[PDB]
Nucleic acid binder design. Structure first.
Lengths: 105, 157, 50, 492
RNA sequence: AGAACCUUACCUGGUCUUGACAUCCACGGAAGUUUUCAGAGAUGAGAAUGUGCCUUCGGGAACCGUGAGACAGGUGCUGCAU
RNA sequence: GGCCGGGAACUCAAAGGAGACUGCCAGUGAUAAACUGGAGGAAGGUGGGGAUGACGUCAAGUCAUCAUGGCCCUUACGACC
RNA sequence: AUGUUUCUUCUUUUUUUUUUUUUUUUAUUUGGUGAGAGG
């Protein structure tokens, strides 16, 4: 973001900014956190089934928007509802954002 | 404090085009002596790193068991994959009279009086898994009272 | 120091390690300078006061 | 000569990682100051060093200003533009002046200014790079021990200070000893010690635990609070989000090895490690360790907690000189009152009796009904006056008319109490009525009201003789106030 | 990455044993050099000459031999002890 | 006869640098890696060659380079011709 | 198209053991002789 983006090798400087942006999305908003989370709000139980199995290895209460094809056993606070329509996801994301704003008093 | 306890090391192998490579597996167990106990398997290419990696997962694998005064609650079975451990509480049985790999897991759990004997293939890692599920389903009268009858007294007199 | 040997840079001469120092005189007596004589060995440049 | 300037600039730029430009600006200022000292008159001087040759030109600088206060160093914009039309306010007009010969005097001045520039560049960037150290446990060598402070050498011409309050009470350092401490403040005393180091504050304990406990450095365990009596005893509260990790066991380590390493560095300070709880009562129980707590009563309004202990545990709960309760109170943020179970019951009975007496006296209710109000949790007239009507209607035997009457009586009792005190002293009633007479300060109004002169009418009825004993009231001032009161009451 | 002898460890024969190679001990002689016979040579018997260095010179050790036991020697075996 | 003066461009000697990276164009392909061709260039897709030999294999070779654990000979399996 | 065969004989096993610092030498101008003088 400032400094060695030119200093030694221009092609290899394009390697690092090819390294950067793939790491930018995979490790997105996790770098601001540090340490383990306290809860975990999932929007699809079936698709992200690794994390629910991963979070239940530790002591993390999770929050899954579940569709009818998945299995609601590892999730603690199960939420039934559609999750493949875009307008459906903005309900749950808009609710979980505005409520946690009220919770950060 | 944690009172760690080793049971058995082993020399396992696997082969490649160059030859065969050994390693070591070492089943251990840890336990507080007052109702917490946990085992962990662990395996590595050298016995100091094998037993240390065994304990490090045994710390996270601890389970709570509810007992009375150094002995069990009731008789309880223990079946797991060719290892039928029997456990009888034996109120002041004057020592833990059990076989190998049960004498470890019962001691660090904190009991001192149980009579026990393993029926079947006396294999060490499969028999310490046999006592654990046999101990974690064994229930105190408190849990029995608060699901059934709803008096702590009359359920055992 | 680099700055002492940098006498040559701004000016010239050589280095400044040499102790620069003007022969100053001691104390104990006041006075009023009434007469100054200057004698010059022949060949030496007479300065402006001589 | 020429190439030597470039070689010096390159050597200093590479060794001190400093911009060549900043070194030249400072040499120019150094040479200007050395030039100013050769003239008997206060002149302004600019020096310019050529960046390729190392040659330098010296001026008689004339700070272009709007209004000239110093004719020897300042020139008007109109006069500056007569010489060069391109000049603006804040520029310099020059004058061909003989550059000072670079003797060992200028050389010494240049060396001093370079050293000072390096302190504000190389050393400043070193402190910026050591952002962790500025906050973590820096290590220094004791250079000097004074009565009131210890000077530490950190290397690279950085000096730190430990103040007497920042030391442990039993520490004795000698010149040459190595000392660790937290850098808790960076000020701007470049010449001397800008760095302030502590060994006594709680941050020293937190950072020692961060170094000794990897799980704290990895953010797996968090220290939520630390309370400390330096060189005697501390308490730390620890939390983890990982249910597989015991945070207390991790901080203690195998047979206490980790906590003993921290204790040894703190001169044998006793460290208690407690589990942080999000429930305040459970957290205070944990903070009171090693004393067993029998019951807790929480007063949220006073931000206080009454802690009952068994009579055998009372001395342990208080600790030596109250050290255990004080450290628990500092760790929780709550005021902690430690008493026996019998004393807590006696306190609650005395409070219940005082509430019953208050309600019987002010609400005109019987003792039986006052007892029911206290058993339902009402202790003050304010609670009865302001609590939601639904909570008062949940009490067995209260109807909506009786609750309304009880609230009206509680409000009237609160109003009467306030008015009575305001008339007795000078809070509001005498601070307006008796203080109406021009000249009455609040103190004099309360002195008048202490004699039963509570209103402006009461003051209008007085003689000078009735007020003559009031400290600060002269007969003339008494006469003026009585006449002012009479003018308002009898002639308004 | 070089066997006429040498190398060379192999063979016949002639030889010497605290030894050709190191440390140690006690004695005697500077060390060295020249030359002759006997001998296949190894060696044996000599015959001449030299007689230097530090000095406590009752010296010591650079150096040649003779006796002492420690020991020295081994291209002897086992690469499946290394 | 560079044989003599002379000369320092050139050959060469020898130091130190430039240059080749898929950098450019086209095309295909997942707009990815890349691949095929063209340009320029002394040199074009790791330019040509060398040195460099992962964990291990074969208890492969050598105790006769040397060193080395053992065991054996000691007027002898040592030493001289 | 189909292609037989590979002396003999055979192992052991991993929870108690340990290493090292001392280095080397360290205000400045003014002595005699001869004469005079003060106490």
């Amino acid at each position: 973001q400032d400094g060695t983006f030119d200093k030694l090798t221009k092609k290899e400087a394009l390697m690092r900014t090819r390294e950067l942006e793939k790491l930018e999305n995979s490790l997105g908003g996790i770098k601001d956190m540090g340490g383990l989370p306290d809860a975990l709000f999932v929007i699809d139980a079936d698709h992200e089934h690794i994390a629910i199995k991963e979070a239940n290895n530790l002591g993390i209460p999770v929050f899954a928007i579940v569709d009818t094809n998945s299995d609601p056993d590892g999730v603690d606070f199960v939420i039934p509802g559609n999750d493949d329509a875009i307008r459906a996801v903005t309900l749950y994301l808009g609710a979980v954002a505005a409520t946690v704003r009220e919770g950060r008093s | 404090e944690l009172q760690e306890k080793l049971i058995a090391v082993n020399r396992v192998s696997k082969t490649v085009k160059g030859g065969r490579i050994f390693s070591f597996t070492a089943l251990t167990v840890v336990g507080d002596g007052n109702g917490r106990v946990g085992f962990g398997y662990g395996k590595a290419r050298e016995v100091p790193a094998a037993i240390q990696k065994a304990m490090e997962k045994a710390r996270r694998n601890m389970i709570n068991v509810a007992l009375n005064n150094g002995t069990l609650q009731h008789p309880v079975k223990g079946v797991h994959t060719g290892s039928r451990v029997f456990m009888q509480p034996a109120s002041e049985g004057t020592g833990i009279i059990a076989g190998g790999a049960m004498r470890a897991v019962l001691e660090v759990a904190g009991v001192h009086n149980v009579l026990a004997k393993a029926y079947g293939s006396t294999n060490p890692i499969n028999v310490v898994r046999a006592t654990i599920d046999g101990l974690e389903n064994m229930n105190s009268p408190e849990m029995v009272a608060a699901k059934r009858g709803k008096s702590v007294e009359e359920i055992l007199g | 120091t680099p700055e002492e040997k940098l006498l040559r840079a701004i000016f010239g001469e050589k280095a400044s390690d040499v102790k620069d120092s003007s022969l100053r005189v001691p104390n104990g007596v006041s006075g009023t300078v009434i007469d100054v004589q200057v004698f010059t060995r022949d060949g030496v440049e007479k300065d402006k006061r001589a | 000569m020429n190439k030597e300037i470039l070689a010096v600039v390159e050597a200093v730029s590479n060794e001190k990682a400093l911009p060549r430009e900043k070194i030249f600006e400072a040499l120019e200022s150094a040479l200007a100051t050395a030039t100013k000292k050769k003239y008997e008159q206060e002149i302004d001087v600019r020096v310019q060093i050529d960046r390729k040759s190392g040659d330098f030109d010296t001026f008689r600088r004339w700070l272009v200003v709007d209004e000239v206060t110093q004719p020897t160093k300042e020139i008007t914009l109109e006069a500056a533009r007569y010489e060069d039309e391109s000049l603006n306010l804040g520029d310099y007009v020059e004058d061909q002046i003989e550059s000072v010969t670079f003797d060992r005097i200028t050389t010494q001045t240049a060396k001093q200014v370079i050293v000072q520039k390096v302190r504000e560049a190389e050393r400043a960037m070193v402190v910026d790079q050591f952002r962790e150290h500025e906050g973590e446990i820096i290590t220094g060598v004791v250079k000097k021990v004074n009565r009131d402070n210890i000077s530490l050498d950190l290397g690279n011409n950085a000096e730190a200070v430990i103040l007497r309050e920042d030391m442990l009470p039993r520490e004795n350092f000698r010149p040459g000893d190595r000392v660790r401490g937290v850098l808790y403040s960076v000020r701007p005393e470049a010449r001397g010690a800008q760095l302030f180091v502590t060994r006594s504050k709680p941050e020293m304990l937190i950072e020692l635990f961060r170094i000794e406990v990897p799980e704290i450095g990895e953010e797996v365990i968090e220290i939520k609070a630390a309370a400390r009596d330096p060189g005697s005893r501390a308490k730390i509260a620890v939390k983890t989000n990982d249910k597989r990790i015991d945070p207390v066991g991790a901080c203690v380590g195998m047979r206490g090895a980790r906590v003993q390493a921290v204790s040894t560095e703190l001169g044998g300070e006793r460290i208690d490690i407690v589990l942080w709880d999000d429930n305040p009562a459970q957290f205070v129980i944990n903070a009171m360790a090693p004393a067993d707590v029998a019951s807790i009563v929480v007063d949220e309004d006073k931000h206080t907690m009454d802690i009952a202990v068994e009579a055998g545990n009372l001395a342990q709960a208080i600790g030596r000189n109250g050290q255990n309760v004080r450290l628990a109170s500092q760790l929780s943020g709550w005021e902690l009152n430690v008493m026996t179970v019998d004393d807590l019951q006696a306190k609650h009975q005395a409070e219940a009796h005082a509430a019953i007496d208050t309600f019987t006296k002010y609400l005109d209710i019987d003792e039986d009904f006052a007892t029911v109000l206290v058993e339902e949790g009402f202790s003050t007239l304010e609670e009865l006056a302001y609590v939601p009507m639904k909570e008062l209607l949940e009490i067995e035997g209260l109807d909506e008319p009786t609750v309304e009457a009880l609230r009206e009586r509680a409000k009237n009792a609160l109003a009467t109490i306030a008015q009575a005190q305001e008339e007795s002293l000078g809070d509001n009633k005498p601070a307006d009525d008796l203080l109406n007479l021009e000249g009455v300060d609040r103190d004099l109004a309360f002195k008048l009201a202490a004699r039963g002169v509570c209103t402006l009418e009461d003051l209008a009825e007085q003689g000078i003789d009735d007020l003559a004993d009031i400290e600060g009231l002269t007969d003339e001032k008494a006469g003026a106030l009585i006449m002012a009161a009479r003018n308002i009451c009898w002639f308004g």
